Subunit: 451 residues, 4 copies
């Protein structure tokens, strides 16, 4: 059902609990953009699950044993040994976070004319691919773009779409396949092991490389153990190890499923690409022996990755998010289904049907959510999407992203009860109008006002 936290609270973080009238003032000062809210003014911060996790006592013990040597740090040897043991890859290069590893991989495996195809995309990953002269091709199955379609493993790659790309464009013009686990843009949807095995079968026949975006791979591994038949007797670690056996490398953001506040790494099996990675990491991140991370942070990441393999931890992590989604779904609140491993996405298109998409319903829904409850959420609709056009995506959603081991079921009830009350008078949600807008990346800095 909904198991209790498989841990005790070792230490707590003090938070401000300003009343509604105070929160309304803070939201007005922030231009009705949740990205501009001060952390000190937020009760429950569901903006992202990236780097906001709570570490364990064992991780903080490693923090006291930081070997800050520039080369040969014991923390690096611990992290290297851990990733090689759990992921199975031959070579590891630490980076300060995920997009640092993406910067490395995109410069190492992309020729300025090749194609990169994957199960949807992420902002930072696609930028570095296109920065290095690649053209992105989405080969996820079409069901992944249907927010309400409740089917299992929506992140699976359409093998027919991949076969079409290899035929129409040729394998020589395909840089690599970028398989993401889980698929963040589809709502945190998992990829099945049979899909990873089938993708590896087709790519290996044409000499195409496969690189994983593994930031939420542990959450993906739980869905395999829970819903894919034949993996019920397999541990999380066994599933994680089998997942990466169908890849030539991976980029990892430790800030997610490694249960840390900073850190990432790049993995690969090819010796020659590892040599070029060590030469390139020096100018962007640092030495291959620390890669832009303090020694204590490599230690915390090595310990956190091993803690993520505990079944009871990852079961509670996913089922806490599912509890929030189930409570909203039972009250009639429209959400993306099925609930992903790391967040619940409110479908602002259905939530705010009385508002047009030019009126920023997701942004206005996120602003109202904070004022009524003190809960911060991230707009993931047209504004995040960015001639002189608006650019309209199918998904006008508000993301309630759950940090790991930070909040309780009672905190989820505060989020649910407030959204449910807000939904009961959803007609009151007003539209927004732009005040100041940069280019490139406007979701972070734009300001709005009620219409």
């Amino acid at each position: 059902n909904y198991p209790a936290e498989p841990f005790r609270i070792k230490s707590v973080e003090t938070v401000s609990m300003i009343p509604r009238d105070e929160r309304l003032k803070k939201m007005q000062e922030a231009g009705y953009n949740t990205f501009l809210l001060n952390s000190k003014d937020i009760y429950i911060d569901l903006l992202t699950d990236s780097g906001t996790n709570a570490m364990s006592d064992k991780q903080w013990a490693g923090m006291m044993m930081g070997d800050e040597a520039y080369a040969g740090s014991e923390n690096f040897y611990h992290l290297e040994r851990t990733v090689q043991e759990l992921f199975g890859f031959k070579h590891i290069v630490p980076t300060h976070q995920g997009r640092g590893a993406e910067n490395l991989l995109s410069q190492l495996a992309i020729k300025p004319g090749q194609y990169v195809a994957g199960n949807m995309y992420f902002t930072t990953t696609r930028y570095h691919q296109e920065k290095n002269g690649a053209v992105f091709v989405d080969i996820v199955r079409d069901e992944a773009h249907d927010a309400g379609l409740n089917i299992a493993f929506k992140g699976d790659i359409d093998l027919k779409k991949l076969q079409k790309l290899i035929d129409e464009k040729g394998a020589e013009n395909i840089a690599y396949i970028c398989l993401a686990v889980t698929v963040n843009l589809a709502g945190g949807q998992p990829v099945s092991m049979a899909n990873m095995r089938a993708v590896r079968e087709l790519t290996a026949a044409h000499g195409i490389k496969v690189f994983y975006d593994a930031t939420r791979c542990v959450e993906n591994a739980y869905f395999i153990k829970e819903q894919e038949q034949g993996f019920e007797n397999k541990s999380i670690a066994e599933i994680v190890h089998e997942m990466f056996s169908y890849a030539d490398g991976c980029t990892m953001s430790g800030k997610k499923d490694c249960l840390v506040n900073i850190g990432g790494f790049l993995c690969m099996n090819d010796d020659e690409m590892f040599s070029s990675a060590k030469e390139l990491v020096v100018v962007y991140e640092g030495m291959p022996s620390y890669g832009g991370l303090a020694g204590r942070d490599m230690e915390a990441m090595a310990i956190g990755l091993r803690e993520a393999m505990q079944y009871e931890y990852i079961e509670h992590r996913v089922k806490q998010v599912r509890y929030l989604g189930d409570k909203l779904k039972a009250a009639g609140v429209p959400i993306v289904e099925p609930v992903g491993g790391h967040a619940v996405f409110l479908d602002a298109r259905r939530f705010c049907e009385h508002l047009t998409q030019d009126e920023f319903p997701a942004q206005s829904l996120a602003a109202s959510i904070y004022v009524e409850t003190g809960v911060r959420s991230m707009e993931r609709g047209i504004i995040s999407a960015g001639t002189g056009e608006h650019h309209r995506p199918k998904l006008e959603t508000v993301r309630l992203t759950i940090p790991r081991r930070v909040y309780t079921y009672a905190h989820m009830d505060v989020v649910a009860d407030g959204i449910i009350k807000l939904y009961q008078h959803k007609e009151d949600i007003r539209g927004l109008k732009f005040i100041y807008e940069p280019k490139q990346l406007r979701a972070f800095t734009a300001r709005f006002d009620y219409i």
Copy 2:
């Protein structure tokens, strides 16, 4: 109505979570005594709320700023300034925990042969009083001894009983009145402000001193704000300050409402007694500048005491315990009422009516609770009562209970549901619970080391 935690989780503590068949092995290795269980084998440890609290990020920041000087530590000045500000007492002496401060007070304010009267007693406090030649007299009102009587402020002192003591026994023969907030032995029951004022009024008329046992004074202050009329507009800090304005001093166990894992102190307003307190703390605890505590621990206690004054914290603290008690009461599980500020007491006599008290139902109920849920609780019945010194029979108490003591800021409502659901399932087939028989029994304090086996 059961608020969410007024804080986030900064860091977590790893637990093993062994399955039921493994927990049965651990319980058998522990002789069916929860006191002999290893901490590493316990999912939810409700043995005590003493020193088991979770500290805040600000407290751990103070832990990094420990001034470990033997004298004149800045951490002591911060603790001294904090207690003088919040409690109002003139002089402070730190101790390593509560019973260290009780050892000092009992030697400073008791002449051999005098009487000490209080709203019931505690084990360590009464020992140091009687060790120094005092005779304890219970002056709590009779309603406190009714486990099922659900009334407010059961810890209040019966003013007539105190008046009777002053009349039958000379006031010169009364060492002091020991007012405890809350009253742990009655189930964590609070004392009203009107009672503390009346006690201060009566004792001041006869020159009698009043010293508070304030280990859970903050929980007591919340009950005043919630249930005593006239205090709804007053903050927790204002209530705490008014409480101690009716006392000449106090002994504090910081391990409770100061939100720390170690620490205590002794307070008083009398200059002459403070001089003797500084001379006596040297031989038992340490210098008056640290009193058996590391500097970082005085800092954490100074910060934690100020954090306890937050209304939202203490409201959630009390209502989390109340949530556990209400869920048990709604399922028909017999508990001591009303629910105290820090624990829920299962009535093991009614829970295990098919067992006699010679069969240790509370001890057997605690063992089954761990096996079914991984929750450790404390037996508070015949085993804890011990044996009589001369006749060598069982000290048979009216209360055969199992104490579910909640550490502060450590567990969630979901953890309380684990405790409730397991006890409720165990209660639905309570007839299966077997009795226990001694297989090893020490000479004194038997709850800690005794071993048992099923009958």
Copy 3:
């Protein structure tokens, strides 16, 4: 010679560096009593080596793994296993510090008429002995009371004095022998292994118990390895284990050679006395599973005791103190000889020969030391000693007590150079006059003024 610190600095403590004119004001506000100085106003705090030590990264890692359970804490099992391994005793009871263990032992092994004899005494130890109705008898050899006599192992017990006590008073009237390692009052002087072996031989023949005051036992073990023939091939741990094989138990203040800021314990081999110790620790310290200590503090003490067995640590610890004494002795400054393991004692009797003992030379020397350098020292002459008399001891000294791993050789040079300059114009040191004096323990609270 004088080896470098066998460790690196992991973290530093910020200290105030007020000028001389500021320090003079602070000293006047403190009534010229170094005990009343604020820690924030002191550059180098040499008041005591008790609880002022710097812990290691491994100890602070254990601090993050505090098992704060009331019973069955893993930290207790670590501490118990460590002491049983290194000391060899069968039973251990943790206490909040040394005088807590002394309170326990004195109530368990003293009948209100028996004698307690030891190599000199300490204030807290002798109080609890006399509190429980014992009469103290000093059986240290007479050479220990000669501050200038530079001989080895001045802390040895005079076997003839012990034989005289057993004959004149009988073994039935002797509670136990209290052997202290090292002897703090004699200047931190060590006890030889042959002495501990000979004492055990004589006491066992008469059924007398031997209990060690082992607060500085590791420093004692180094002197055995350095100066007693036959122990040069033996490690510190082997020497420590052999030392306690000649004792029935011990009281330990972890605040000394366990490299912690709080903590102690009581050891013994007798099962029946251990049962009574567990009953008595409950009313004074706490449960036998934590004994008035947080779980993290038991962990830090278990780790610190194992770190103390490293030869390079304890060699540098002793030789840093010796460096201070050698630099003062080479300049003509009168000190207690030989230099002990934990402190250097300035002989204020020779330092201030132009002042009488009624003028508190040690107290006035300590006050002047702070004003000129910002160094705090402890007066250990007549004032510490306390009819209506003054009570005159042979030793009018000023103790420069060195915390472990806290200061460097450069800090010792600041102490030495300032004392040497002060000694060159020692005639300027003025006498003191009492302003306010309590009874029982007057060194802590008394105030003075210049004459």
Copy 4:
């Protein structure tokens, strides 16, 4: 004259301290390359002063108060307020370390084909400049290239060389002047305030921007207070603020003079460039609210930067390095002069005159230094210079040196004596030092992974 540490040791780091015969084994396993040594096998690690510093108790207290929010973290506001207060710049963007900020600045202020001129260069800074289509021009005064010339402020820019560049190359074709304080490649040599003012005067007349490489700016500020007339009455903070008043921005590696183990930031006054900086930091470092750093690390850097402004700290920092250099110079050991703010450079060409540069004397000297003392140092000569891209021969530099880089607040004078005494003993029989020959050599960056064997 060599002051004592202006602080106490709060906590220590455990070291192994293996004997000489064991260290020889470790050095052979590392192919006689100090870069391949394990940190656990090193007594004194003088490889770099970057990110190896010891933090204070106040910094570790801030580490416990990490606000790990993705946006609007209080730690960012503290860092932003601190840099704006101490440096005077209008806008701040955090980065994970210095070369992250250099990556941003090079893409923001360089159009392809422009010139970048500075007082010598650094490896990472020059790479990002040339990666973005710039041509580097050295405008340091000629005295900086004389290793033995003991003069003050060798890092000053030759104003005539800058005037010549503006004349021969149009000012529109000059991206910016990159003024580094201190100059690491010249041995950590400082830049005078009069030079920074003259550079600002000349560049402002032609509309040219000036950006500082300020990683060791605090050490530079001490040299101004110590050796430049007119600044003896000014505090370190006042000097730092005046230095940056002659710049339009800066790139900072907090891993140096901010007393942290990770962190950096990018500063500027131009509003338009700051808008582009926030857009570019997202794809490389992270949000402008954390920029690739944990919240606790921004807090530690904010606290450490304020601690670096203490005169007594930075005086001891510089004079501890000077103590090592003076002890070597007094024994006849050849070093680069004057001693820089952060390291001492051994002249391995003179130290090992019996060896040719093809025999890697600096690499062989570093290996012997570790075997005799357990001290790791960095080879800074022919091996670090690498090979030419086309012809494939050795890049032969004038400086064949061994760098003894001192982390801040990590070691004592006794540790410096260990370094000096071992090098002095090694110098007394320097003829025994053998040459090295390649047994494994990578394709690029060979100092890190290459292996050697004795000839």
